[PDB]
Every structure is written in structure tokens, then in C-alpha cells.
Amino acid sequence: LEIPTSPLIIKITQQERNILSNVGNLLVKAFGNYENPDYIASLHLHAFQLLPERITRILSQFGSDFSAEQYGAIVFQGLIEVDQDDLGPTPPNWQGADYGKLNKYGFICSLLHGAVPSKPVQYYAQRKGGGLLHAVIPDEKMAATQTGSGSKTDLFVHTEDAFLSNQADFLSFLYLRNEERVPSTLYSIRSHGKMNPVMKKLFEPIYQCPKSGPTASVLYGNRELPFIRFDAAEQIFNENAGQTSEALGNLMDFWDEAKTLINSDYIPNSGDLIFVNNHLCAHGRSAFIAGQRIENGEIIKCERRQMLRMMSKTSLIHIRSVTRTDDPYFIMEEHLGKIFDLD
Ligand SMILES: O=C(O)CCC(=O)C(=O)O
Ligand SMILES: [Fe+3]
């Protein structure tokens, strides 16, 4: 067994980059925007027909790969060319993002999800939906917070929406800007190798997954090669987590083993995309001061970090009891089965 300790790195070629750009432009002209119901309905057809063949092959292989050798993450280096001057300054927060300017990127990202094959979705739990594509920008008003809008503190490794029974299957993180040279942290359940006594206790549905309350298993799926639902900040380093002495102990014993396996080697460049199997690989990023980097004992001022996130589900059927009646891509789940009580 070759235990995976790092993600697969794919160096995108100039020809691939040029195909993606032309195909992105074409889809913008044809459908207006990536949330067009006609485009979403024929997504997989557009993905398999319009993407560079090597991208399609990589993502198809990845979608059904849950083997011992599979890390659960891919870095697509130089997927897109970002013209920094055209992009202009980073808005003060995600609310200031110009999705008219990010439209082509949303098309490109949705094609990658559609080749898994997987369908982009939105969550009421995340910005009351906020669309299929989210701009992740450091907000000065939320500098030391444990969110995507944060900066000043370490964003602990977590799988996305550990508190939801219908959390994303796949995630894409498109880096438009990372001039602060913030490392992206990744953690795979596969980095542990063979099933062990510490891991086995996590299959027990005795754990709190904060958004008494309902409990769930941290490990699920196959007993030998499991899937993971984990949030270190929310489940372990939270005074209000409400874990039992037994569960907290198990989580702590697990965190001790897991923290040595966290990979912080990759520093994304502008135009890089990280593609994640949200059932295998947790993500985070180190602390940073937005709009600056330190080099040879001097402060270098720069444009603020800007990343685009897209989430997807492989089945609209399984999630149908938690989606909107008139939108099967809009997840209304609040906490482990419970739906948001709105009206
Ligand atoms: O900034 C990052 O790379 C990760 C932020 C994050 O946790 C997210 O978009 O879910
Ligand atoms: Fe996240």
C-alpha cells in the first residue's frame, strides 16, 4: 500500500487553458449565465463535450475513486489566466463581488463538477443560498473569525458543512489572487492508511456536529476505507460543542493522530484550482494579514486574497426531501436532517 500524503498535482497546459477560455466565452454568449436552467439541465453534456479530454478523464476517474491510494484532492495548476488589472481591486467583503465579471469562471467551474459527474448546488445554511458560485474574500470586520471571510487566525481543517446530512460531495476552490502566499491546508482520511483502533471509535453515532441536539458518526461508508465528516474547530475546540466525555476523548485521540498528517505544502497561485472529494479530504488555510506578505524582514503590500467556491451533489434524488419544491438544487437542510423553519 502506497498511503497518499499529498494531493495529485496536474499542470494545465497552454492549449488546455486556451480551450477552457474559448469554451467559457462561448457558454457566456450561448446561455448568459451559469445559473441558466437550460445550461444546468444539459450540464454533463456540456462538460464531456466542451472540456479538454485530459481534464474529463482525470475528473471521471476521481469521481468514483474511493480506494486506499486516493487522497481525495487534485490541484489543477494554472487552470485559468487571471488578468489582475481587469479583475481590479478585491471588494471589502464577499457582498461587493461582481459576479458579472466572474460569470466565465462560474461556467468553467461548473463544467469541472459536471465531468465528475456531479451537479452544482446551493445551501440555505451558506449565505441563504448565495448562488452556485461564492466569492471567498477576507472581510476586515471578520479578521479573527473561523470562516471563509476570515484571515488573522488559522482556519482549522474541516470537511464542508459537517453539521448537514446532505453536505457537498465535491468542492472546487478557484484562486484568483493569493499574493499574501497563504498555504492551503489539506487533510485526507486516507493518509491514516489501514483502519486502526483510534479510527474505529469514530463510526459510533455518538458525536455532536454543531451548526439537546442530534449526534452523528465522524466515519461512515465502507468500514475499511471510510468517508469522513469532520470539523476540528466546531467539534473539538469549541466550549459549547456539548460532547460527552467519551466522544470528546475519541475526537481528541483522533485529532492527535490526524494533525501529523495535515499537508500545508501547497501555496496556490493565481489561476490554480483545488478540486476536493468532501467525503475524503478536509481543507483549511493558515493565518495571514489580508493585503500583505513579509519578505527578507520587510512588509510587502499587495491586493487582497480572492477565491471562488463551488459545491456539488452527485444525486438530486437522495437530497429531494431537503430541497425546495421548485428548485431541486437548493438545499434547505439546517442540521442533521432538520430543515430550516422559515414561514
Ligand atoms: O480560503 C480557503 O482556501 C478556504 C475557505 C473555506 O473554508 C471555504 O471556502 O469553504
Ligand atoms: Fe470550508
Classify the C-alpha dihedral 113-137-333-74 as positive or negative: positive
Q: Which residues contact 150 (CB under 8 A, 6 or more apart)?
A: 138, 139, 142, 143, 144
Resolution in A: 2.3
Whose CA is closest to 73, among 216, 252, 262, 281?
Answer: 281
Whose CA is closest to 43, among 309, 316, 308?
Answer: 316
Q: Ligand 1: which of 156, 283, 310, 312 to mutate, judged by most atoms within 8 Å of the beta carbon?
A: 283
Residue 158 assigned as binding residue: yes
**Ligand 1 site, residue 288, Cβ cutoff 6 A:** no
Residue 113 assigned as binding residue: no
Cα separation, 101 vs 90, in Å, equals: 12
Q: Ligand 1: which of 172, 231, 285, 310 to mutate, judged by most atoms within 8 Å of the beta carbon?
A: 285
Residue 324's beta-bridge partner residues? 327
Look at ligand 1, atom 7, and give the residue with the nearest C-alpha.
Answer: 148
Provide the domain limits for residue 269: 1-343
Give the C-alpha distances (Å, rounded to integers) separating 256 from 3, 192, 199, 249: 18, 12, 11, 11
- 135 close to 273: Cβ distance less than 8 angstroms: no
- 134 close to 176: Cβ distance less than 8 angstroms: no
Which triple of cell numbers denotes residue 186?
489539506
Burial group, residue 195, by CB count within 10 angstroms (0-12, 13-18, 19+): middle
Total number of domains in the chain: 1
**Ligand 1 site, residue 307, Cβ cutoff 6 A:** yes
Residue 178's beta-bridge partner residues? none
* φ and ψ of 110, to 5 deg: -65, -35
**Ligand 1 site, residue 184, Cβ cutoff 6 A:** yes
Residue 179 assigned as binding residue: no
